[PDB]
């Protein structure tokens, strides 16, 4: 069977650089062009570079031109990717491909200067007009923490109905943010206290944030 084994990924700092390797087996490596393709967390597929069977011809994505160098050692049946001046937009799983036919399992490259950082918690206040009759949405914005994970609860676990906590986004800063929302009776906004409980164990931080109606 065709096998492509990537290595050399990991955490690196922005402006830094990294060397992916992909070792081939089960086919005549030197007969075939190779490609690198990458996939940012949550996103689609983005081609990075092409290299001909002999190695004498290369092509690069415009996003990467002047910064990455693809190469190969047909004696060692290895494909390489020299990624220079790494920036947050480069964070992705990187796949090696033979032609466009078979993909390695991928190597994660994380481009961040983030150190451990607890979140800032901001209230998502319910709109004052949907506070008379019916239901209202309120929440907490859990901003700019690193690394994963955080946990969010409401009223120390007493409020679970109508709750949805979203997965986090990874921002161009290398820090994560997420939100948690709960739908409650409008009539309760006067009488019931709503507190989101945020726990970020990697920084030994807990935050309780009271979410109150806004004065319009």
């Amino acid at each position: 069977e065709v096998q492509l084994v990537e290595s050399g990924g990991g955490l690196v700092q922005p402006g830094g650089s990294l060397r992916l390797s992909c070792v081939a087996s089960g086919f005549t490596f030197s007969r075939f062009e190779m490609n690198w393709v990458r996939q940012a967390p949550g996103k689609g597929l983005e081609w990075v570079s092409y290299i001909s069977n002999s190695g004498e011809t290369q092509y690069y994505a415009d996003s990467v031109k002047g910064r990455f160098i693809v190469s190969r050692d047909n004696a060692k049946n290895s494909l390489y990717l020299q990624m220079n001046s790494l920036r947050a937009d480069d964070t992705a799983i990187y796949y090696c491909l033979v032609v466009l036919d078979y993909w390695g399992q991928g190597a994660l490259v994380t481009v961040s200067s983030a150190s451990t950082k607890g979140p800032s918690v901001f209230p998502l206040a319910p709109s004052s007009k949907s506070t008379s009759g019916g239901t209202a949405a309120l929440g907490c914005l859990v901003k700019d923490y690193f690394p994963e994970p955080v946990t969010v609860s409401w009223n120390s676990g007493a409020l679970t109905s109508g709750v949805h906590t979203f997965p986090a986004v990874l921002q161009s800063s290398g820090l994560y943010s997420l939100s948690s929302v709960v739908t409650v009776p409008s009539s309760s906004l006067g009488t019931q206290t709503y507190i989101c409980n945020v726990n970020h164990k990697p920084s030994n931080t807990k935050v309780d944030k009271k979410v109150e109606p806004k004065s319009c």
Binding site: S120, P123, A125, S128, P167, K214
Partner: protein
Amino acid sequence: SVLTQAPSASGTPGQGVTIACSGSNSNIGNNYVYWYHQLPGTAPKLIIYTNDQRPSGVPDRFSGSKSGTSASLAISGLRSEDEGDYYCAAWDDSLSSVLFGGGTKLTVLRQPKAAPSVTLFPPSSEELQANKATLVCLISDFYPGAVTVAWKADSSPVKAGVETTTPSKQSNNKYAASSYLSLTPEQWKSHRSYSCQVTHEGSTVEKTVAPTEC
């Protein structure tokens, strides 16, 4: 030049579906189209190569075709193992690059379709006093679990500063998603309005907030 795919394709067990890929002469018009199937968490697998060829192991329920500047992947007899994301790709001569379509999520329908509701929060007074501003667009109660989100400042699209999560299941077995627009306090106060637009199947729903209102 970009390859364009619809976000979502769906059918009940046993139905057929067609996934379109639309391009232009620099790419699909003159070059070979490839199709891939991906389960999130694992690498893509080849489904169609060179417009219409199937690799060993791909069932003949999958077939590819190309005409003019468009390509299509047909899937008959939909089964659970077909669900996942499908991507088309082609070389583009003007860019000297392999382009990928944006991905089509294929869903085998298990429950009725459901249109999203959208809640849009303006930046909190707390955050603004921290010299930051985030608009929070929360999208709920939809099925199948694929949407497109776009943002507008007043009436013009804004692409910078946007982050959107992949939909995941709510407690009521429908999907939710979130999108964020990061602004400076200056931009938020200087525009008349901001909107998040959510496209699901053949509807777009748009919610708007203004800095001068509740």
